Structure 1
Amino acid sequence: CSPPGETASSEPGTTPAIWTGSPSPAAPSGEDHGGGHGAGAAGAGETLTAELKTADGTSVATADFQFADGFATVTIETTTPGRLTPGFHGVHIHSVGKCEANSVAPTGGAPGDFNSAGGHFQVSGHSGHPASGDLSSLQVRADGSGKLVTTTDAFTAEDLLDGAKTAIIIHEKADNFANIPPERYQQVNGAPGPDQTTMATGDAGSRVACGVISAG
């Protein structure tokens, strides 16, 4: 006999729609928490990234700051192809983590990503030299990508989980951090030294990108 399930030519099929493959609940016996580490303190993990947001809500860069072996490793990679400008960018840790479009903690003009309660996110007793608020440069070449992987041991996972969450910001200019020599330069008031605003944070423009470091 002939087998019953054959011989039916309809219209010869739609082309098979692209395999949007579902994820895998075979692996799913495991929940990815904040991470696993030591840190004999109030408690933290070993991995907490960040998403740098612009003034339109879109992502510009992506930071990842975490304590691994007593050294806060911070890797800032690019997110968009044409976000940053053709030049060096100055990374700086802000004390408040609000990446608002227009906000100002003190009485003054609300600039772009200026929701911090001051400048550099230093220690709770530190106000002077280049602490954990100031960071190295993540320069953007003609390709439009700024990557900077550094290891700053000034802060750790117990310092970034404060009462106010911190952030990582990048302006349209580079990172100066009081790089004015007093032997040849001069101030507008004739002073040999630099300004206090240039001592708190680096000399740059308005903050273009900003991202909260609370696992963003």
Structure 2
Amino acid sequence: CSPPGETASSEPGTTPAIWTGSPSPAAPSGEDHGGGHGAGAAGAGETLTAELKTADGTSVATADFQFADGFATVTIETTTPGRLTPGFHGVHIHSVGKCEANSVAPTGGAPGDFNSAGGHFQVSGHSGHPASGDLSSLQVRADGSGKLVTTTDAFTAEDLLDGAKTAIIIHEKADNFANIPPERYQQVNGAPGPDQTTMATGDAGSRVACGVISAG
């Protein structure tokens, strides 16, 4: 005798498809935790990255923001060795997460990477001083790299998980906030007070980088 089933010359066959393994069911339900966080919203977790790109479609910076033990433990690294020039790029948090090359939410001039729906994306109940929307100057030297953090937690993961995706936008200015006080300095009109546009958020020239923080 010979084995009943052999010798199927016909039906040449097909290349196997790329395997897409299904997740382990309740049986092997064990899986790695995606990150613990307060998550006072629909849920974001302790893991969230983003890529701040330029007007040419090339990545400039790569930010990371996520709650760890009730506070966002974030970190940003320059994705290219010559993204930022020898100076301080002023970071800020824009409520609008669209990191478009150039957009204008209101009726007016559309600045480069100006998709933000205002200045600094403050909290829902906070619209005065420079809340978590505001950010200071991060410096890139002749090496051209950016990595340094601060403590800006006017918002949390719940606040980040807002109605509209937010973004991190780096313009080409430092962080002063009307360093010239009214005692000595004067404005264009002679009033010793500061400018509302400068006070609400960091105003600079054309935006250098912009990246949606919606797990970009």
**TM-score after normalising by structure 1:** 0.81
> For the residues of structure 1 that align with 2:184 and 2:27, how far apart are their CA atoms?
64
Check 1:158–1:3 CA distance in 2 against 1; reply closer, same or farther (3 A cut): closer
Query: Using a 3 Å threshold, how does the CA distance of structure 1 residues 107 and 15 change in structure 2: closer, same or farther?
Result: closer
Tell me the alpha carbon deviations over residues 101-146 of structure 1, each in whole angstroms, 9 at most, x when there is no partner. 1210001110111011101010112111121011132101111112
Q: Any stretches of 5+ residues in structure 1 without a counterpart?
A: none
Q: Which moved more, 1:77-86 or 1:20-29?
A: 20-29
Task: Write the distance in 2 (CA, Å) between the matches of 1:103 and 1:31.
Answer: 42
User: In 1, are the aligned partners of 2:93 and 2:168 still within 8 Å (CA)?
Assistant: yes
Distance 1:135-1:18 versus aligned 2 partners, 3 A rule: same
Contact 1:139 1:146 in 2 (8 A): yes
**Residues 43-97 of structure 1, C-alpha deviation per residue, up to 9 Å, x if partnerless?**
2200101100110111000111111122222322111011111101111000100
User: Aligned to 1:197, what secondary structure does the other structure show?
Assistant: helix
Which residue is 2:34 aligned to?
34
Question: After superposition, what is the alpha-carbon deviation per residue over 1:168-214, rounded to whole angstroms, capped at 9, x for unaligned?
Answer: 01112222333331111111111111011011112422211000001
Q: Distance in 2 between matches of 1:117 and 1:22?
A: 41
Residues 19 and 75 of structure 1: CA distance in aligned 2, closer, same or farther (over 3 Å): same
Corresponding position of 2:212? 212
Query: Alpha carbons of 1:40 and 1:174: their partners in 2 closer, same or farther (altered >3 Å)?
Result: closer
Deviation string 1:10-30 (CA, Å, 9 cap, x unpaired) is 999999999999999999998
Normalised by the length of structure 2, the TM-score is 0.81
Q: Would you say the 8 A contact 2:94–2:168 is kept in 1? A: yes
Question: Partners in 2 of 1:91 and 1:120 — Cα distance?
Answer: 10
Instruction: Measure, in 1, the Cα distance between the counterparts of 2:22 and 2:41.
Output: 40
Q: Against the structure 1 CA distance between its residues 5 and 91, is the aligned structure 2 distance closer, same or farther, given a 3 Å change threshold?
A: same
TM-align CA RMSD: 5.8
What is the alpha-carbon distance in structure 2 between the residues aligned to residue 156 and residue 195 of structure 1? 28
Check the 8 A contact 2:137/2:173 in 1, yes or no.
no
Within 1, Cα distance between the matches of 2:116 and 2:39? 27
Change (3 A) 1:125 1:15: closer
Shift in alpha-carbon separation, 1:11–1:59, aligned structure 2, 3 A: same
Aligned pair in 2 of structure 1 residues 95, 7: CA closer, same or farther (>3 Å)?
closer
The answer as to whether partners of 2:46 and 2:66 remain within 8 angstroms in 1 is yes
CA distance in 2, matches of 1:11, 1:86: 65
The answer on whether the counterparts of 2:135 and 2:202 sit within 8 Å (CA) in structure 1 is no
User: Judging changes above 3 Å, is the alpha-carbon distance between structure 1 residues 22 and 132 closer, same or farther for their aligned structure 2 residues?
Assistant: same
Asked if structure 2 preserves the Cα contact closer than 8 Å seen for 1:112 and 1:206, the reply is yes
- C-alpha spacing 1:34/1:161, structure 2 compared with 1 (3 Å): farther
Distance 1:28 1:180, change over 3 A: farther
SS in 2 for 1:89: strand
Cα gap change, 1:82 to 1:19, in 2 (>3 Å): farther
1:181/1:45 CA distance change after superposition, 3 Å: same
Change (3 A) 1:179 1:55: same
1:34 Cα deviation (Å)?
A: 5.1
Please state how far the C-alpha of 1:4 moved relative to its aligned partner. 32
